C-alpha cells in the first residue's frame, strides 16, 4: 500500500544498531524503529564514493 526507502551512511560496524530491539546512540537518538517494523536493511561499501 506504500513503501518508504530510507537511506543514510554509517561507519560500517554501526549497522548492528540499526535494527528493532537493538540499542546504542544511533538507535536511541537518530534512527529508531518500532517493534512492528516491516522491511529490509540493505547496505554496501562506499569507500570510493563517500
Amino acid at each position, epitope marked *: 500500500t506504500n513503501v518508504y526507502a530510507d*537511506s543514510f551512511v554509517i561507519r560500517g560496524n554501526e549497522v548492528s544498531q540499526i535494527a528493532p530491539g537493538q540499542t546504542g546512540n544511533i538507535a536511541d537518538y537518530n534512527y529508531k524503529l518500532p517493534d512492528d517494523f516491516t522491511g529490509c536493511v540493505i547496505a554496501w561499501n562506499s569507500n*570510493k*564514493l*563517500d
Partner: antibody
Amino acid sequence: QMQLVQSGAEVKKPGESLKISCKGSGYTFSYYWIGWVRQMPGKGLEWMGIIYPGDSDTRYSPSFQGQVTISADKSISTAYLHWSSLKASDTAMYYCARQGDLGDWILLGYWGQGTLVTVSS
Amino acid sequence: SALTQPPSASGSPGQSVTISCTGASSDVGGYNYVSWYQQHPGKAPKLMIYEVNKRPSGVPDRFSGSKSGNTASLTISGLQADDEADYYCCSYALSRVVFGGGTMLTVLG
C-alpha cells in the same frame, strides 16, 4: 602542484585502433577518480566514463559502453584510452579530468592538456 | 535528461549578465547538484561554479550561481575582455555527469 600530462596528437586511417595515455603528478594516484571527456571540433564537452585507481570499477557513459575502453596503471600512475576501429566521427580533443580536494566525487575539478585525434582517407 | 543552454550570449562590458541552464536533475540527497565550467579558445576547460549556493575555493567573486525550479543560471558581476570564452553547465545528482549544449559569450564596445 598537481598536473596531468598527455600524449601528443595522433593521426591514423579510418578503421584503425588507437591508444593514448595521460599521466598525473603531484598527488597520490590511489584515491582520485580518473576519466576522459570528448570534445569534437566546434562541439561541446561529452563525458565518457571514470575509473578509480584503487580498483578497475569502470563506469562508462551510456553512449560509450562498448565504443571505447578506459583503464589506468597504478604502478606508474598513468591513465589510458584505447579505441577500436576508429571512425570518421572519432576525431576530437580528449581531456583527462579528475576530482579535486573538495566537492562531489564526479565534479571533475581538474582537467588535462588535451590530446588531438584526426583521421582521413 | 540532457541539459540545454542558450546558443550564445552577449552583453556590454561593465554590465552584469546571466546565462541560463535548463535540465537540472535531483536525487534524495538534495537539489543543488549543479556546476559550471569555462573554456577559453585553445585550452582545456576549468571548473567555475559548483553547488550553486557556493563555489569552488580560490575562484573570484565575479561568478555566482543560482537556480529556480528546473532551470539553473550563472550570473557574472561584470563583463570584461577575458570573459570571451565558452561556458557549459553540468549536473551530478544521479551519480552521473552530462554536459549541456554550451554557449558562446562575447562583449560589445
